[PDB]
Amino acid sequence: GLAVFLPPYPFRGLKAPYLWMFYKYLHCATDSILFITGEDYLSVTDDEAQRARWEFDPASMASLGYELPNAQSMACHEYLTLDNAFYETLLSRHHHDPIKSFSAFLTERIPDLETELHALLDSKKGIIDQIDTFISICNCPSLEHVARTLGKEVMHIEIGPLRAPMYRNTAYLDFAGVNGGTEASARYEKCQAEFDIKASLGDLHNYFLEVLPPAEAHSAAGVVLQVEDDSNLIAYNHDFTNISLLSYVRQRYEKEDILVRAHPGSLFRLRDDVFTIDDSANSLAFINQCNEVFTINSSVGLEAILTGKKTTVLGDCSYAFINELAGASATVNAAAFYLFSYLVPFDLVFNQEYLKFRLGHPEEREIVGKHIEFYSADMSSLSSLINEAISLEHH
Amino acid sequence: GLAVFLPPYPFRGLKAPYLWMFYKYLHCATDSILFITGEDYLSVTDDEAQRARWEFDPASMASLGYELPNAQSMACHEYLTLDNAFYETLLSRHHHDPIKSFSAFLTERIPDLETELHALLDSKKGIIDQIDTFISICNCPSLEHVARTLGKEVMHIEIGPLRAPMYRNTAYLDFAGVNGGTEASARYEKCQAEFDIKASLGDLHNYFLEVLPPAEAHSAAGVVLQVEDDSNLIAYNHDFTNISLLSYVRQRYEKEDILVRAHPGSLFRLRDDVFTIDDSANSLAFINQCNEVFTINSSVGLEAILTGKKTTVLGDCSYAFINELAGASATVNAAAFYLFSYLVPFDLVFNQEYLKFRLGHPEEREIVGKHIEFYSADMSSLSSLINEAISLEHH
Ligand SMILES: CC(=O)N[C@@H]1[C@@H](O[C@@H]2O[C@@H](C)[C@H](O)[C@@H](O)[C@H]2O)[C@H](O)[C@@H](CO)O[C@H]1O
Ligand SMILES: CC(=O)N[C@@H]1[C@@H](O[C@@H]2O[C@@H](C)[C@H](O)[C@@H](O)[C@H]2O)[C@H](O)[C@@H](CO)O[C@H]1O
Ligand SMILES: CC(=O)N[C@@H]1[C@@H](O[C@@H]2O[C@@H](C)[C@H](O)[C@@H](O)[C@H]2O)[C@H](O)[C@@H](CO)O[C@H]1O
Ligand SMILES: CC(=O)N[C@@H]1[C@@H](O[C@@H]2O[C@@H](C)[C@H](O)[C@@H](O)[C@H]2O)[C@H](O)[C@@H](CO)O[C@H]1O
Ligand SMILES: Nc1ccn([C@@H]2O[C@H](COP(=O)(O)O)[C@@H](O)[C@H]2O)c(=O)n1
Ligand SMILES: Nc1ccn([C@@H]2O[C@H](COP(=O)(O)O)[C@@H](O)[C@H]2O)c(=O)n1
Ligand SMILES: COc1ccc(C(=O)NCCCCCCCCO)cc1
Ligand SMILES: COc1ccc(C(=O)NCCCCCCCCO)cc1
Ligand code: NA
Ligand code: NA
Ligand code: NA
Ligand code: NA
User: Which residues of A are annotated as a binding site for 3-deoxy-alpha-D-manno-oct-2-ulosonate?
Assistant: First the structure.
């Protein structure tokens, strides 16, 4: 079965931080799952003091495709709960900086957490044998060390950079790292010579578009801001922040030529009069107003690259290698590989059979074939598969 | 004469960043000054592309007490200008992160900058002999190393934590460091036994108040936010940011009990619905609504301490040592020493005679006497001097 790691540590100030993925795995479960999580994930549903969070919003349940679980649903799974007291110990070991504690969680081993993971997995005979893989929503060297000792793989799984409603929902599935330390570039490198994609970047973008474009845009410099305590801005950012990203652009452009777009999930917005503030209904309308795009490691950086905009990417992320190729032809091929083979149809990362498939580490051809089958469920070599999928969308 | 260091490096995206202090020294000059600055400080006045900045606002000129300079004014001083090309070199040595370059400027030696400072000071015979002290608006180990080689002191001088209109204007004057690495605590330690202040913290606060209080406030937890690229949040912050400060408070309080106040000089404000946002006309009205106050190293932390609020100070700053004393009596004495001896009447740090005075390193008694003379210009031991000054305000 699956061992899904959903840590309860409230680094950013919210209990059950990964509640949406908990709900999605529960909803899609074909088999009994092993959850390694916190007490808070089980009780949050009967806690009216936070019934207003976004995971209970019907639009959120519709866009992500889950239902709130019930006793029947939950009852057929096993739960290992981490203890809240080690959290306070960890905070006190980092000057009580919860965000610096997050960073350490994401990027360093925590021997005490290893030891508690080992005891939880040991607490019931047979648990370890039934584990076919770990699944983790974030990098976590504590868990990766435990997994090595036990001979288990760790799938790092997250929502992807293309998301509804603008796009088909995508997910990350990476055996090395999600967002930071990813294997997307290394998987492409072993395939770069087995590529001949007869489509432009626009076509790749069009394939995932679920909406009509805004179209027909100007502002020399677009600045993408991110959520300030996103793991992306905590560990994978090369020390850049929204404020230093903004200064970086001002080293290059006069204020009149800068268009700034705050992240809609952020607790902060821009002061209304100093730079021009973007008011677009979506990040695609925002980048269409822009000649150049500047980001640390936002999902929007990928959007800009696919629509052909000169993009500056200051942080580490899964898609950066596409931007670092020099040839236009290589850039198209890399983007196609990223979109059709690295990225996963969102629902499939919660599908047990699909996960078993990937655990066998099959050929790139097979992975692309499975993804296109999903994408096409209502409408050969690797190149041949993607060219036909695109062609079928064309008419 | 004075050698005033006003670096031109636009780390935060503005040319002539320290233009206000340039104007204030020019306005108050009784003698010819040596300015070590950038070309931009001289030409900014004839540049209409930024006539809208705050240093040209009449309210700003009135509150700080300077006039815009003219040819006569400027003409009797000497100017050493730093070259813009080393700036680009420095940025490229820090991954083109302007804020990380700022940090390095504030906290590490830059041999190439030492070498250029040495050449500028050498470029005209006699310059070095006429230097009685350096004045710097920020810590700068490049300049401190040069100063040691030449046998010159470095006065670190800044606007203080109490400012008009709420307060009499104050300034910092510190031979070791301003904001970070300060000597306020060490100066108090040599005097702690020569103290007997017969006033409360409220009286000390009242002495500097220039306004009627808002009065009569509740919200358990006040969170003071700062400007995101303030040197205080770049180098002296112990890695804390507004976002991690906010999370720190959420580890301790429910969202309902949190009152957040954004800095009015910030480019960012808070999202309108998640925490309660302070709308006070001034930081004093904001902290009066609060049972506890949380800051990294804002000037407001001092305000909270003087009004008796439980204050948490997560970063380094000049006033923190006051908060770390355990006795109420010691806390009062430390605050009195800080306010009357460490802090300086704003105008005096631009007064050449006063600076010559401090360069002689006189007794704490003498420093307090001079400050009270200034404060009293229109109305003994060290304790005796402050008790009488307070008493005279009383009636
Ligand atoms: C209406 C629709 O198709 N919505 C998408 C979700 O699909 C629905 O919910 C899942 C649970 C079913 O398996 C599908 O057959 C479908 O009925 C989907 O889960 C999410 C994620 O891609 O996207 C919605 O748009
Ligand atoms: C499904 C989704 O994208 N949700 C968004 C949130 O991101 C998810 O939840 C947090 C807990 C994780 O750290 C993210 O990595 C991701 O898995 C996001 O935090 C909020 C606010 O921007 O918006 C949701 O839509
Ligand atoms: C009106 C007033 O006193 N304003 C204060 C400033 O003082 C004035 O300007 C200076 C240049 C003169 O030397 C003073 O005699 C006075 O006329 C003062 O400079 C600033 C700073 O403390 O504060 C104003 O409130
Ligand atoms: C005189 C004053 O307090 N001005 C405020 C600005 O601070 C000063 O200017 C910058 C360039 C320095 O880095 C500060 O250390 C200080 O000397 C401040 O930046 C702006 C915005 O908050 O507000 C002015 O009033
Ligand atoms: N400045 C920003 C950043 C993100 N976004 C939206 O948020 C989603 C996730 O972006 P991040 O990866 O930047 O969190 C993007 O696909 C885009 O829809 C936005 O609309 N404006
Ligand atoms: N959150 C904040 C921070 C500062 N301030 C004001 O800004 C001035 C300087 O504060 P900092 O030292 O925090 O920059 C303070 O004296 C106070 O008047 C405010 O009004 N609200
Ligand atoms: C306040 O406005 C300003 C702000 C900064 C400058 C300034 O010195 N630029 C020089 C370096 C610019 C970096 C370009 C690197 C190119 C590789 O990408 C001028 C004016
Ligand atoms: C989402 O709400 C939350 C957020 C965090 C917690 C939580 O685990 N607190 C435990 C540590 C709190 C730190 C106090 C240290 C005391 C020294 O100052 C609970 C609920
Ligand atoms: Na499409
Ligand atoms: Na490229
Ligand atoms: Na007063
Ligand atoms: Na104290």
Answer: 12, 158, 163, 179, 231
Hey, which residues does B3 pair with through a beta bridge?
B34, B134
Resolution (A): 2.3
Can you tell me the distance from the alpha carbon of B342 to that of B327, in angstroms, rounded to the nearest whole number?
20
User: Using what technique was this structure determined?
Assistant: X-ray
Closest CA to B259 of B251, B250, B268: B250
* DSSP 8-state secondary structure symbol assigned to residue A278: P
Q: Which residue, B133, B169, B181, B123, is CA-closest to B346?
A: B169
Q: Is A224 in contact with A249 (CB distance < 8 Å)?
A: no
CATH fold, domain B183-343+361-395, is Rossmann fold (3.40.50)
C-alpha distances out from residue A337 to A17, A340, A347, A365, Å = 31, 5, 19, 10
Q: d(Cα B9, Cα B16) in Å, to the nearest integer?
A: 8
Whether residue A165 has a cis bond before it, omega within 30° of 0: yes
The residues spanned by each domain of chain A are 2-152, 201-327
d(CA B241, CA A97): 10
Residue A171 contacts residue A159 (beta carbons within 8 Å)? yes
C-beta of residue A201 within 8 angstroms of C-beta of residue A307: yes
Core vs surface per residue A72-93: b (16+ CB within 10 A) or e: eebeebeebebeeeebeebbee
Residue B217: burial class (beta carbons within 10 Å; 0-12, 13-18, 19+):
exposed
Q: Measured at the alpha carbon of residue B304, what is the angle toward residues B298 and B307, in degrees to the nearest 5?
A: 150
B89, B97, B223, B229: which to substitute to probe chain A, counting the most A Cβ within 10 Å?
B97
Assess contact for B262 and B277: CB atoms under 8 A: yes
Of A229, A51, A307, residue with least CA distance to B242 = A229
A213 Cβ closer than 6 Å to some ligand 1 atom? no
Cα B327 to averaged position of ligand 12 atoms, centre (Å): 7
For residue B7, cis peptide bond before it (omega within 30 degrees of 0): no
Flag whether residue B246 sits within 8 Å of chain A, measured between CB atoms.
yes
Query: CB-based burial of residue B252 (10 Å sphere; 0-12 exposed, 13-18 middle, 19+ buried)?
Result: middle
Instruction: Report the amino acid identity of residue A84.
Output: N
For the CA atoms of B384, B388, B389, B392, what is the dihedral angle to 10 degrees?
Answer: 180
Q: How far apart are CA B328 and CA B199, in angstroms?
A: 12
DSSP state of A167: B
CA distances from B233 to B6, B59, B144, B227, B297 (A): 20, 27, 22, 7, 8
CA distance B287 to B323: 16
Alpha carbon separation from A329 to A42, A313, A382 (Å, rounded): 50, 20, 16
* Residues around the ion ligand 11 (C-beta < 5 A): B 209
Does ligand 1 have an atom closer than 6 angstroms to the CB of A41?
A: no
Question: What count of other Cβ atoms lies within 10 Å of the Cβ of residue B280?
Answer: 14
Instruction: Give how far B99 is from chain A: nearest CA, Å.
Output: 6
8 Å CB contact between B14 and B59: no
From A7, A236, A232, select the one nearest A113 (Cα to Cα).
Answer: A7
Three-state secondary structure readout of B292-320: EEEECCCHHHHHHHHCCCEEEECCCCCCH
CA atoms within 13 A on the CB side of A249: 28
